[PDB]
């Protein structure tokens, strides 16, 4: 009942943003095929692999 | 080599499922966003102008 | 020597059948994974977006 | 009907990994020609063969 | 002559597997590139135009 | 379930390499006809033969 001052689309935007990171990470992992691609993952695994 | 490959080399079986996961959630949330943005004009309709 | 061979030296006849069985189950599981993963978008379609 | 947090593909994936061990063991068994390849199989047979 | 053979003359047994690796990775990469670049039109879907 | 980096074909390659030595030794033995053609074999036998 308000003019864009308290609209509930913001929570949907936030949820889409949260799932965007998962989507990008999944696509990148499909592309590379490696479980760890950078330091954002478990750094210990990267060090052990190296 | 076999031991090292267990830490790297992400299992594609779970990754394709997670890909479909993320895609479907993203587009469903997009449609829900559109539906939510389709809500405000009820007050304009009640304005009768 | 022939006694020793009777403990080692797996019979190829059973192992080839096991090989084919394993390959069939593997690709069957791949196909079932794909088909099952293609299910969730029924809710997406229901959402009408 | 749930939002993708209880997908049944997990069972299929688990079964695929269960059959992966059998597949790898079968291929290795074909390659070697020897029933015993390591201690993972019947160790007593390996010791007796040695 | 055998000595010189041990330096040059790469083993084909490793190279066939390396070729299979390279070809499979290239196919998977091109397919995932297509799957990635077919995503952006969700913003067009949001616009409802 | 991974791309040829956990490939079990490495075991096949290893076994091929192990049997290659036996195959080459057998061919060389047929060609020469003598058990001891170098000191790879029992050096004591070679000394006694000399």
Which token pair is B46?
A: 């009640």
Residue of B nearest to D3 (CA): B25
Q: Which residues contact B2 (CB under 8 A, 6 or more apart)?
A: F6, F10
Which chain F residues touch B2 with a CB distance below 8 Å?
A: 6, 10
| Residue listed under structure tokens 């079990």 | F8
Say which of A8, A29, A49 has its CB closest to residue B36. A8
CB atoms within 10 A of CB E37: 9
Angle at C33 between CA C32 and CA C36, to 5 degrees: 80
Q: How many Cβ atoms are within 10 Å of C37's Cβ, its own excluded?
A: 20
Resolution to one decimal, Å: 4.2
Tokens coding F30: 């047929």
Max distance between CA atoms of chain D, in angstroms, equals 59
Facing residue for F13 by CB, picked from E13, E25, E28: E13
B41 touches chain E (CB under 8 A): no
Q: Residue C47 and residue B28: Cβ atoms within 8 Å?
A: yes
* C29, D15 Cβ separation under 8 angstroms: yes
D and C in touch (3+ CB pairs within 8 angstroms):
yes
- Solved using: cryo-EM
Query: Which chain D residues touch C29 with a CB distance below 8 Å?
Result: 12, 15-16, 19
Distance CA F14, CA F18 (A): 6
**Cα→Cα distances E37→A34, B24, E43, Å:** 21, 16, 13
Question: CB within 8 A of E33, min separation 6: which ones?
Answer: A31
Measured between CA atoms, the residue of chain A closest to residue B19 is A26
Six-digit token pair at E4?
């010189």
N-term to C-term CA, chain B: 73
Residue D22 half-sphere exposure toward CB, CA atoms < 13 A? 17
CB contact under 8 A, E28 and A30: yes
Please name which of E31, B27, F41, C10 lies closest in space to residue D26, comparing C-alpha atoms.
C10
Contact E29, B16 (CB under 8 A): no
């Amino acid at each position: 009942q308000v003019i864009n001052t308290n609209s509930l689309s913001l929570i949907t935007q936030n949820n889409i943003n949260k799932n965007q990171s998962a989507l990008s990470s999944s696509i990148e992992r499909l592309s590379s095929g490696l479980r760890i691609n950078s330091a954002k993952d478990d750094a210990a695994g990267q060090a052990i692999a190296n | 080599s076999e031991a090292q490959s267990r830490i790297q080399d992400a299992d594609y079986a779970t990754e394709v499922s997670n890909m479909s996961k993320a895609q479907i959630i993203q587009q469903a949330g997009n449609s829900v966003l559109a539906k939510a943005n389709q809500v405000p004009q009820q007050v304009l309709s009640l304005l009768q102008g």
